[PDB]
Structures are given as structure tokens and as C-alpha cells.
């Protein structure tokens, strides 16, 4: 669940 990916 890292807010951002696929792009983290």
C-alpha cells in the first residue's frame, strides 16, 4: 500500500 506506485 506505498501511496505513489507503480511510481513510489
Request: proline share 14%; aromatic share 28%.
Amino acid at each position: 500500500g506505498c501511496v505513489x506506485y507503480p511510481w513510489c
